[PDB]
Write a protein that binds this ligand. Structure first.
Ligand SMILES: N#CCOC(=O)c1ccc(-c2cc(=O)c3ccccc3o2)cc1
Ligand SMILES: [Zn+2]
Lengths: 161, 47
């Protein structure tokens, strides 16, 4: 059911997504161990993910949340990095994309910092880096992140290191 | 998958040490996210 539509770099929609990608890079505590050393990306492609079934599944749930929260979905656009990005775009997020060992328990994790989600593209802690060079800091291999519409509703605020 | 805390639909991890870090979020239902954009990229070696 999924089709991928390429956005032209001339399209304001390409540009606003690129800008969220570049402007939310930060330095990480690990000095780059997990995600590599960089201050910015080379954006190769941005594709709109279109799946009617997955969309309606999203909006159905969004309405439930909204109605439990004074008509406020509390919807954000947030980044997600995962070895399972190809399964996600075709089949949607499910419990198999959950970070079992995550610090806020076994759920599906999203970041405002693109560079944070970057640390997970090749696995937790960056795994063994890219398939080809086994380099967590590979400057050659193509990586993929998802920029996602996420319903938070009433969010439990955890202050944390 | 675990459950949202009672009364809540998600968790926010607020950074409380690293001044520069933005927030992280957790949902406990796959249906509460839609993967809208696939971005293909390389990281760039600083100069
Ligand atoms: N357990 C298990 C299977 O774990 C994963 O494959 C997996 C774990 C974490 C992520 C993930 C992806 C993220 O983008 C992310 C953002 C902020 C904080 C944590 C984050 O973690 C993605 C996949
Ligand atoms: Zn590589």
């Amino acid at each position: 059911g999924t089709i991928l539509i390429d956005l032209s770099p001339d399209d304001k929609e390409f540009q606003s997504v690129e800008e969220e990608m570049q402007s939310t890079v930060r330095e990480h505590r690990d000095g780059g161990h997990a995600g590599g050393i960089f201050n910015r990306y080379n954006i190769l492609k941005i594709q709109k993910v279109c799946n009617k079934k997955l969309w309606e599944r999203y909006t159905h749930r969004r309405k439930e949340v909204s109605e439990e929260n004074h008509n406020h979905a509390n919807e954000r656009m947030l980044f997600h990095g995962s070895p399972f990005v190809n399964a996600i775009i075709h089949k949607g997020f499910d419990e198999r994309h959950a970070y079992i060992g995550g610090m806020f328990g076994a759920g599906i994790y999203f970041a405002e910092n693109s560079s944070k989600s970057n640390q997970y593209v090749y696995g937790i802690g960056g795994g063994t880096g890219c398939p080809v060079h086994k380099d967590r800091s590979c400057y050659i291999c193509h990586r993929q992140l998802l920029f996602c519409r996420v319903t938070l509703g009433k969010s439990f605020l955890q202050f944390s290191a | 998958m675990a459950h949202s805390p009672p009364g809540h639909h998600s968790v926010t991890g607020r950074p409380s040490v690293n001044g520069l870090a933005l927030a992280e979020y957790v949902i406990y239902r796959g249906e509460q996210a839609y993967p809208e954009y696939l971005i293909t990229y390389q990281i760039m070696r600083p100069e």
